[PDB]
From a paper:
We then collected data in the absence of calcium, ensured by adding 10 mM ethylenediaminetetraacetic acid ([name]) to the nanodisc-reconstituted sample. In order to identify potentially asymmetric conformations, we initially processed the resulting dataset without imposing symmetry, and identified two classes. Although both contained non-conducting pores similar to the calcium-containing structure, one of these (sym, 2.4 Å, 58 % of assigned particles) exhibited five-fold symmetry and was further refined with imposed C5 symmetry. Aside from the absence of ion-like densities in Sites 1, 2, 3, and 4, the sym calcium-free conformation was largely superimposable with the calcium-bound structure. The most notable difference in the absence of calcium was a local loss of definition in the density associated with loop F, indicating calcium may stabilize this region in a closed-pore state. Whereas no major changes were observed in the ECD-TMD regions in simulations with or without calcium, the NTD exhibited more flexibility, particularly upon calcium depletion. In simulations of the calcium-bound structure, the center-of-masses (COMs) of individual NTD1 lobes deviated up to 13 Å from their initial positions; in simulations of the structure without calcium (in the sym conformation), such deviations increased up to 25 Å. Similarly, NTD2 lobes deviated up to 7 Å with calcium, but up to 15 Å without calcium. Global properties also exhibited modest destabilization upon calcium removal: from an initial value of −26°, ECD twist varied in a 7° range with calcium, but in a 12° range without calcium.
Pentameric ligand-gated ion channels (pLGICs) constitute a family of receptors responsible for the rapid conversion of chemical to electrical signals in most kingdoms of life. To date, the only pLGIC in which an NTD has been partially characterized is [name], derived from a symbiotic sulfate-reducing deltaproteobacterium related to Desulfofustis glycolicus. The [name] NTD accounts for roughly half the total receptor mass, and appears to accelerate activation and deactivation of the channel. Like several pLGICs, [name] has been shown to be inhibited by calcium ions (Ca2+), mediated at least in part by a calcium-binding site at the ECD-TMD interface.
Residue numbers in the entry:
A (entry chain C): 242 to 321
B (entry chain D): 322 to 637
C (entry chain E): 403 to 562
Amino acid sequence: APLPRLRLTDSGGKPLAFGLIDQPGESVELNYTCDQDICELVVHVDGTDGQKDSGEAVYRLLVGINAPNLRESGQTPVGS
Amino acid sequence: SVFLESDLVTVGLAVDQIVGVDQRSENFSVVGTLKLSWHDPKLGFSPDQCGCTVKSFEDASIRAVAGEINLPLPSFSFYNQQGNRWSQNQVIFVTPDGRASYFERFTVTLQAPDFDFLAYPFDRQKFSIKVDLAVPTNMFIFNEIERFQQVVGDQLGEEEWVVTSYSQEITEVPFERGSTNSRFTTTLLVKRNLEYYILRIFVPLFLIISVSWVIFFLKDYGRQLEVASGNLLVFVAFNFTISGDLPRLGYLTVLDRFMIVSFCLTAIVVLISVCQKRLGAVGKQAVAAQIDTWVLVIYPLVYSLYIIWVYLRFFT
Amino acid sequence: QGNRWSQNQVIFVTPDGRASYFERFTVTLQAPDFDFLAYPFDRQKFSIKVDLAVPTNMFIFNEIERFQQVVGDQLGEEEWVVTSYSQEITEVPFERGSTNSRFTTTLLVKRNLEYYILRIFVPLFLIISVSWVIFFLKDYGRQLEVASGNLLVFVAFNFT
């Protein structure tokens, strides 16, 4: 399946970060840090580059908080 | 633009099911869906004061929301509404840019003073649904028509009324305190089920008329008189049996006139039979045979001429 | 009688002080003066009375305005046909003395005569003629049989 676009926005839609394509271009990654007292985030994943009906493209999403080792987690999903 | 511009409203309506027609009070009831959309920058807000992208109002009419938020909104009403209107899924939601939309599912009864049942059961009617804005045209005006669904929906099973065609139009009509208000009209053209009436009424009536007609081949006039007397009673029995499908409107239709003519001819048959019986009693059988031939020749011609006259006077 | 249904009810005023009221209504009214003794050849009067709820020293009807036709035309036939109409302003006794204004609209109506005539009287005449004609016969058994059948035919038509 083709690589989709990734971006991070708050609950109001204000953009905060955008995805970066790695040199081994098989995945897209994102990073952000919290500055305000309370931050509510929304993660956007879309593949609407054009109007092609590709069909049943399926992707895996990995997300973590205070977990910079998401590249090689090892452990099964922990915490809440 | 130096001058202020009227706000543009997009409207659309769909009909789901016709649930009843009252032929004496001249009204019908319908179930459907209505949708409105307009753009107003005065309704815009900032996301950071609520942490949301959509602000919504539920279970409230447009007038109530306008009174609560103290801003002008495009209220509407049904022109020929009779009694209260049942509403479901009523919601108004607004985007930060100022785009607003209205949704409603309704069940309403509408007056139809234009009904005409003169040609019953071959009559064709018009079902008109009118939506009028309750504001002058200088504030809000209908601009576009949106087709969110099929205007006329299909349902399983047969229907008493069959829709042949439909149309939608936007016009302007005079408004109270002068000025003008927009009107959105949906018109449905309908007709009845002809096979039901034909097979249920006309074939048995034709058979009864044929029974009354065929008895003139007999030369024993007592049997002819007895069969005519019985067939008149059979005709009356069939007439009241089908009286259930005979609407009481206070004025005559085609079916009533046809029944009256058939009854009159059936009674004249008995009268002629009595006259022929007396003539045969006196000894003038030749005149009776001549009368038999005359009746056999004349009766279908009279029926055909009456049918032609009715067609000329009611269908052209 | 009962509640009244109203549509497009609005009151609007101008800075000079000129105000007007508008309403579209559907109402049911009692008519104790009905008389159906001469049915179906009876004639009836439909009276609509509007009474002010204030004494005549505060408000009073002064003029009659014909903004539209008093009786409107509609497509198709009607059970009741209006022959004439009239409008008048009068004064009637009011509670706690004084007087209140009244505006009355009267409609004269009649039924559709051709319907009743053609649907009832001609078949009845034919049945009576059938009962009358049998006396020319000199075979009295046939006359008795036809009379017995015609009585049942008459009963059948009557309940029909």
